[PDB]
Symmetry: D2
Subunit: 115 residues, 4 copies
Amino acid sequence: GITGTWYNQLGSTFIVTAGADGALTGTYESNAESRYVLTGRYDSAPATDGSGTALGWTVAFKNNYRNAHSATTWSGQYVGGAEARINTQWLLTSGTTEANAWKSTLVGHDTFTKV
Amino acid sequence: GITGTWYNQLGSTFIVTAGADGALTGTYESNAESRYVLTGRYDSAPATDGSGTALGWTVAFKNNYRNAHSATTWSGQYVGGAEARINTQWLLTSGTTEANAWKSTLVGHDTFTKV
Amino acid sequence: GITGTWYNQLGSTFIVTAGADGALTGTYESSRYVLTGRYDSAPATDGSGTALGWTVAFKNNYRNAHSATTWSGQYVGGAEARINTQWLLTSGTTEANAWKSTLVGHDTFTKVKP
Amino acid sequence: GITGTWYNQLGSTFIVTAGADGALTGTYESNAESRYVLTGRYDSAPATDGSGTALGWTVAFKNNYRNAHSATTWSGQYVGGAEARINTQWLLTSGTTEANAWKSTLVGHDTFTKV
């Protein structure tokens, strides 16, 4: 149930394909200039006791039009049902010098839904 | 630079290839039963001011022999500098029922060297 | 403002007093546990929220989970006042297990109970 | 073993007193202008299994001389011995309008020593 289009609570969209071999591939859209490659992995053989399915993905915010010198990783789980959701925590890291490496990484969370 | 074999503090091993317009491919190891696919992205065109290179990757802990029902993401940066390092922060999510979701994610930090 | 009884999404109760010097004191029920913390007693005019944080160690007369949680976040006043936080829960582990010592999560607190 | 003067890798210094039933009280500094109150809690009855002692504390970055409109919380554990250390992860949150809340919280790690 992961394959498809997902929307977060504030304008972002991603299209993902979940491969048989646990791969996650797609596009993240924040114009073709706000589109980025997404790649990741997911548990292709989860438990059927009501647990969600573990997954993660990465976007590096560089495309042929712009480069924010920053990458985000999302770690979380897919939960199906009538109300399917991907609940995540993410880490945003920017390229800094050594002296500023202390302030390099933001942390947040994101919920994605199919509508 | 990023391409190579890296080791963290505890002793795990990650072999990565940096290619494409920023693809990260490879394996994580902690023997063949401990090997898992890794996938991520990186800033293929970092700043020229001495900043590091942002990157992220994902490992889902399922292979042909084992399934921990969980995935880890590393968010961080590559420093070419003195000895090259990758300094990361990570999130490990496990699939949980919805009632135990509050304790699904661990957070920690990892430094990699080619030594 | 911040002073009052707060509840998170999971029904836990946070009774806190905001002092005039930026101290936060009170009690947390996830019986009760002592909480202490700090807040910005003079935030920005500009519509910014108020930065704050607090800690609870999960030890009282009944039980001891050998753990402490810290919440860091901000208060946003409004028709619906709310406190948006990220938290870190650290348990005592041996050295070899330290890598799995810390959970991370997010709590939203509100003056109305779920 | 917690009561005293602790130092992180970045210069920063913290003086804490551990009260008998779990209180942590002290100052965080790096001159008066750079001095701020800290308060936290610790497990006043740790396990005897050689596990460490859980604690946490908070500093809000406001004193009589300046206001960063920020608060940092440290969550971690005291590890005793000759090489006594406090290992932490932290969250730094800044006040932000609702529009900039995604980028309000920094995450990182710090290690404290008695020397």
